Protein backbone atom coordinates (compact mmCIF):
# COMPACT_ATOMS: atom_id res chain seq x y z
CA UNK A 1 0.00 0.00 0.00
CA UNK A 2 0.98 3.64 0.41
CA UNK A 3 4.23 4.32 2.33
CA UNK A 4 2.56 7.50 3.58
CA UNK A 5 -0.27 5.26 4.86
CA UNK A 6 2.41 3.21 6.64
CA UNK A 7 3.70 6.51 8.10
CA UNK A 8 0.11 7.22 9.23
CA UNK A 9 -0.11 3.78 10.89
CA UNK A 10 3.20 4.29 12.71
CA UNK A 11 2.02 7.80 13.58
CA UNK A 12 -1.17 6.55 15.26
CA UNK A 13 0.97 3.87 16.90
CA UNK A 14 3.43 6.41 18.35
CA UNK A 15 0.56 8.72 19.44
CA UNK A 16 -0.99 5.97 21.54
CA UNK A 17 2.45 4.64 22.67
CA UNK A 18 3.69 7.94 23.96
CA UNK A 19 0.40 9.53 25.01
CA UNK A 20 -2.04 6.83 26.21
CA UNK A 21 -2.21 3.83 28.50
CA UNK A 22 -0.80 0.44 27.67
CA UNK A 23 -4.22 -1.18 27.21
CA UNK A 24 -5.02 1.43 24.53
CA UNK A 25 -1.61 0.72 22.96
CA UNK A 26 -2.28 -3.03 22.90
CA UNK A 27 -5.81 -2.60 21.49
CA UNK A 28 -4.71 -0.31 18.66
CA UNK A 29 -1.63 -2.42 17.90
CA UNK A 30 -3.81 -5.54 17.70
CA UNK A 31 -6.31 -3.89 15.35
CA UNK A 32 -3.54 -2.54 13.14
CA UNK A 33 -1.58 -5.82 13.11
CA UNK A 34 -4.83 -7.55 12.25
CA UNK A 35 -7.83 -5.89 10.56
CA UNK A 36 -11.48 -5.29 11.60
CA UNK A 37 -12.39 -7.38 14.63
CA UNK A 38 -15.31 -9.00 16.26
CA UNK A 39 -15.24 -8.39 20.00
CA UNK A 40 -15.28 -12.13 20.78
CA UNK A 41 -12.20 -12.77 18.68
CA UNK A 42 -10.33 -9.90 20.36
CA UNK A 43 -11.42 -11.17 23.79
CA UNK A 44 -10.03 -14.58 22.83
CA UNK A 45 -6.77 -13.10 21.52
CA UNK A 46 -6.10 -10.96 24.58
CA UNK A 47 -8.01 -13.14 27.14
CA UNK A 48 -9.64 -10.09 28.71
CA UNK A 49 -13.01 -8.97 30.07
CA UNK A 50 -15.65 -6.63 28.68
CA UNK A 51 -15.36 -4.60 31.90
CA UNK A 52 -11.75 -3.89 30.96
CA UNK A 53 -12.72 -3.44 27.28
CA UNK A 54 -15.33 -0.78 28.12
CA UNK A 55 -13.43 2.40 29.13
CA UNK A 56 -10.83 1.85 26.39
CA UNK A 57 -13.50 1.72 23.67
CA UNK A 58 -15.27 4.68 25.32
CA UNK A 59 -12.15 6.88 25.35
CA UNK A 60 -11.37 5.89 21.76
CA UNK A 61 -14.91 7.05 20.92
CA UNK A 62 -14.21 10.25 22.86
CA UNK A 63 -11.09 11.08 20.86
CA UNK A 64 -12.99 10.17 17.62
CA UNK A 65 -10.51 7.46 16.65
CA UNK A 66 -12.18 4.05 16.27
CA UNK A 67 -14.99 3.78 13.73
CA UNK A 68 -17.31 1.05 15.00
CA UNK A 69 -19.35 -1.08 12.62
CA UNK A 70 -22.62 -2.87 13.41
CA UNK A 71 -24.08 -5.50 11.07
CA UNK A 72 -25.73 -8.90 11.46
CA UNK A 73 -24.45 -12.12 9.90
CA UNK A 74 -25.78 -8.70 15.22
CA UNK A 75 -22.00 -8.64 15.00
CA UNK A 76 -19.81 -5.80 16.25
CA UNK A 77 -16.87 -4.60 14.15
CA UNK A 78 -14.26 -1.87 14.57
CA UNK A 79 -12.09 0.14 12.19
CA UNK A 80 -10.73 3.70 11.91
CA UNK A 81 -11.95 6.40 9.55
CA UNK A 82 -8.74 7.97 8.24
CA UNK A 83 -9.92 11.60 7.64
CA UNK A 84 -11.92 11.57 10.89
CA UNK A 85 -8.80 10.43 12.74
CA UNK A 86 -6.58 12.95 10.91
CA UNK A 87 -8.93 15.89 11.51
CA UNK A 88 -9.51 14.86 15.14
CA UNK A 89 -5.73 14.74 15.68
CA UNK A 90 -5.43 18.08 13.85
CA UNK A 91 -8.03 19.75 16.06
CA UNK A 92 -6.41 18.15 19.12
CA UNK A 93 -2.92 19.47 18.28
CA UNK A 94 -4.27 22.91 17.32
CA UNK A 95 -6.22 23.13 20.58
CA UNK A 96 -3.12 21.98 22.51
CA UNK A 97 -0.99 24.65 20.79
CA UNK A 98 -3.50 27.47 21.29
CA UNK A 99 -4.48 26.49 24.86
CA UNK A 100 -0.87 26.05 25.98
CA UNK A 101 0.19 29.27 24.22
CA UNK A 102 -2.58 31.30 25.90
CA UNK A 103 -1.84 29.60 29.24
CA UNK A 104 1.84 30.49 28.80
CA UNK A 105 0.88 34.07 27.86
CA UNK A 106 -1.26 34.40 31.00
CA UNK A 107 1.36 32.68 33.15
CA UNK A 108 4.14 34.96 31.90
CA UNK A 109 2.26 37.79 33.56
CA UNK A 110 2.75 38.05 37.35
CA UNK A 111 0.49 36.42 39.85
CA UNK A 112 -2.06 38.50 41.67
CA UNK A 113 -2.81 38.11 45.39
CA UNK A 114 -4.16 35.20 47.47
CA UNK A 115 -6.47 35.41 50.47
CA UNK A 116 -6.02 32.33 52.72
CA UNK A 117 -9.33 32.86 54.54
CA UNK A 118 -11.77 32.93 51.62
CA UNK A 119 -9.42 30.83 49.37
CA UNK A 120 -10.13 32.72 46.14
CA UNK A 121 -8.17 34.00 43.16
CA UNK A 122 -7.33 37.67 42.71
CA UNK A 123 -5.33 39.63 40.14
CA UNK A 124 -2.86 42.50 40.41
CA UNK A 125 -5.16 45.01 38.72
CA UNK A 126 -8.04 43.94 40.94
CA UNK A 127 -5.63 44.37 43.86
CA UNK A 128 -4.76 47.92 42.70
CA UNK A 129 -7.92 49.13 44.43
CA UNK A 130 -7.39 46.65 47.30
CA UNK A 131 -4.64 48.77 48.87
CA UNK A 132 -5.38 49.94 52.40
CA UNK A 133 -5.21 53.53 53.67
CA UNK A 134 -1.45 53.25 54.33
CA UNK A 135 -0.24 51.19 51.28
CA UNK A 136 1.12 48.50 53.62
CA UNK A 137 -0.95 45.37 52.96
CA UNK A 138 -3.56 44.62 50.33
CA UNK A 139 -6.88 44.94 52.16
CA UNK A 140 -9.65 42.39 51.62
CA UNK A 141 -13.22 43.58 51.05
CA UNK A 142 -14.72 40.64 52.95
CA UNK A 143 -12.10 39.18 55.29
CA UNK A 144 -10.25 42.49 56.01
CA UNK A 145 -7.13 40.34 55.69
CA UNK A 146 -3.80 40.92 53.89
CA UNK A 147 -3.38 39.49 50.41
CA UNK A 148 -0.24 37.49 49.55
CA UNK A 149 1.14 36.89 46.04
CA UNK A 150 0.79 33.43 44.38
CA UNK A 151 3.56 31.15 43.06
CA UNK A 152 2.89 31.12 39.33
CA UNK A 153 5.28 33.80 37.93
CA UNK A 154 8.07 31.21 38.01
CA UNK A 155 5.70 28.72 36.37
CA UNK A 156 6.12 30.86 33.21
CA UNK A 157 9.39 29.07 32.44
CA UNK A 158 7.76 25.76 33.45
CA UNK A 159 4.90 26.19 30.95
CA UNK A 160 7.41 27.35 28.33
CA UNK A 161 9.56 24.26 28.97
CA UNK A 162 6.51 21.97 28.89
CA UNK A 163 5.42 23.56 25.59
CA UNK A 164 8.91 23.20 24.09
CA UNK A 165 9.42 19.60 25.25
CA UNK A 166 5.92 18.60 24.11
CA UNK A 167 6.64 20.35 20.80
CA UNK A 168 9.82 18.28 20.47
CA UNK A 169 7.86 15.09 21.23
CA UNK A 170 5.14 15.99 18.71
CA UNK A 171 7.68 17.16 16.10
CA UNK A 172 7.67 13.67 14.45
CA UNK A 173 3.86 14.00 14.43
CA UNK A 174 4.17 17.51 12.93
CA UNK A 175 6.54 16.14 10.26
CA UNK A 176 4.15 13.26 9.55
CA UNK A 177 1.27 15.74 9.22
CA UNK A 178 3.43 17.75 6.80
CA UNK A 179 4.04 14.60 4.73
CA UNK A 180 0.29 13.86 4.85
CA UNK A 181 -0.36 17.38 3.51
CA UNK A 182 2.19 16.58 0.79
CA UNK A 183 0.27 13.37 0.09
CA UNK A 184 -3.43 12.78 -0.64
CA UNK A 185 -6.07 12.36 2.06
CA UNK A 186 -7.99 9.10 1.61
CA UNK A 187 -11.22 7.96 3.26
CA UNK A 188 -11.60 4.59 4.97
CA UNK A 189 -14.65 2.38 4.77
CA UNK A 190 -15.55 -0.84 6.54
CA UNK A 191 -15.27 -2.56 3.15
CA UNK A 192 -11.93 -0.82 2.48
CA UNK A 193 -10.61 -2.25 5.75
CA UNK A 194 -12.23 -5.56 4.71
CA UNK A 195 -10.05 -5.48 1.57
CA UNK A 196 -7.00 -5.52 3.90
CA UNK A 197 -8.33 -8.41 6.01
CA UNK A 198 -5.56 -9.88 8.17
CA UNK A 199 -6.96 -13.11 9.67
CA UNK A 200 -6.72 -13.25 13.48
CA UNK A 201 -8.28 -16.63 14.05
CA UNK A 202 -9.76 -19.61 12.21
CA UNK A 203 -13.15 -20.02 13.96
CA UNK A 204 -14.55 -16.47 14.04
CA UNK A 205 -18.33 -16.82 14.26
CA UNK A 206 -18.78 -13.23 13.12
CA UNK A 207 -18.38 -13.34 9.34
CA UNK A 208 -16.30 -10.39 8.12
CA UNK A 209 -18.59 -9.63 5.18
CA UNK A 210 -20.35 -6.34 4.45
CA UNK A 211 -23.85 -7.43 3.35
CA UNK A 212 -26.38 -4.57 3.14
CA UNK A 213 -30.00 -5.47 2.45
CA UNK A 214 -31.71 -4.86 -0.87
CA UNK A 215 -33.18 -1.38 -0.83
CA UNK A 216 -30.56 -0.07 1.62
CA UNK A 217 -31.71 3.46 0.93
CA UNK A 218 -30.58 4.95 4.24
CA UNK A 219 -27.95 7.64 4.53
CA UNK A 220 -26.45 7.24 7.99
CA UNK A 221 -24.28 9.62 10.06
CA UNK A 222 -20.62 8.67 10.24
CA UNK A 223 -21.06 6.39 7.21
CA UNK A 224 -21.36 8.71 4.18
CA UNK A 225 -19.58 11.57 2.44
CA UNK A 226 -20.81 14.87 0.91
Amino acid sequence: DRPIDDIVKNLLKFVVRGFYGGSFVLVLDAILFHSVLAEDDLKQLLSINKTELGPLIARLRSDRLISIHKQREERVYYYVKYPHAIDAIKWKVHQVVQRLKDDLDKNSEPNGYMCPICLTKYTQLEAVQLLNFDRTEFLCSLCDEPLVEDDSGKKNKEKQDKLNRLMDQIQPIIDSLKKIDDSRIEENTFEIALARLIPPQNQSHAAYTYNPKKGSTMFRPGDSAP
Binding site: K214, G215, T217, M218, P221
Partner: protein, 56 residues
Protein backbone atom coordinates in the same frame (compact mmCIF):
# COMPACT_ATOMS: atom_id res chain seq x y z
CA UNK B 1 -32.23 12.80 0.88
CA UNK B 2 -35.77 12.37 2.17
CA UNK B 3 -37.49 13.49 5.30
CA UNK B 4 -38.68 10.59 7.48
CA UNK B 5 -42.31 10.26 8.49
CA UNK B 6 -42.32 11.53 12.05
CA UNK B 7 -44.62 10.06 14.70
CA UNK B 8 -44.91 11.71 18.10
CA UNK B 9 -44.27 9.12 20.81
CA UNK B 10 -44.17 9.58 24.59
CA UNK B 11 -41.28 11.90 25.41
CA UNK B 12 -39.16 11.54 22.25
CA UNK B 13 -39.44 11.47 18.46
CA UNK B 14 -39.04 8.78 15.79
CA UNK B 15 -38.88 8.93 12.03
CA UNK B 16 -39.35 6.39 9.27
CA UNK B 17 -37.48 7.32 6.09
CA UNK B 18 -39.39 5.54 3.34
CA UNK B 19 -36.97 6.97 0.75
CA UNK B 20 -37.83 4.33 -1.93
CA UNK B 21 -34.54 4.46 -3.82
CA UNK B 22 -34.13 0.86 -5.03
CA UNK B 23 -35.19 -0.53 -8.42
CA UNK B 24 -38.60 -1.54 -7.08
CA UNK B 25 -40.97 0.54 -5.00
CA UNK B 26 -38.84 -0.44 -1.94
CA UNK B 27 -41.32 0.54 0.76
CA UNK B 28 -38.96 -0.21 3.65
CA UNK B 29 -38.74 2.44 6.38
CA UNK B 30 -36.38 2.32 9.35
CA UNK B 31 -37.67 3.65 12.67
CA UNK B 32 -34.73 5.43 14.30
CA UNK B 33 -34.82 7.55 17.46
CA UNK B 34 -34.30 11.21 16.58
CA UNK B 35 -31.18 12.06 18.55
CA UNK B 36 -31.25 15.54 20.13
CA UNK B 37 -27.65 16.03 18.96
CA UNK B 38 -28.62 15.62 15.30
CA UNK B 39 -31.65 17.91 15.68
CA UNK B 40 -29.37 20.46 17.41
CA UNK B 41 -26.74 20.28 14.66
CA UNK B 42 -29.26 20.49 11.84
CA UNK B 43 -30.79 23.50 13.63
CA UNK B 44 -27.30 25.00 13.84
CA UNK B 45 -27.09 24.65 10.04
CA UNK B 46 -30.07 26.94 9.21
CA UNK B 47 -29.92 30.41 7.66
CA UNK B 48 -30.86 33.62 9.45
CA UNK B 49 -33.28 34.51 6.65
CA UNK B 50 -34.84 31.10 7.16
CA UNK B 51 -35.28 32.07 10.82
CA UNK B 52 -37.02 35.29 9.73
CA UNK B 53 -39.29 33.27 7.46
CA UNK B 54 -39.93 30.77 10.26
CA UNK B 55 -40.82 33.49 12.77
CA UNK B 56 -37.62 33.21 14.79
Amino acid sequence: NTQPTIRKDGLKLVGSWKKDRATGDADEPELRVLSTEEILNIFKHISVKDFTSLGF
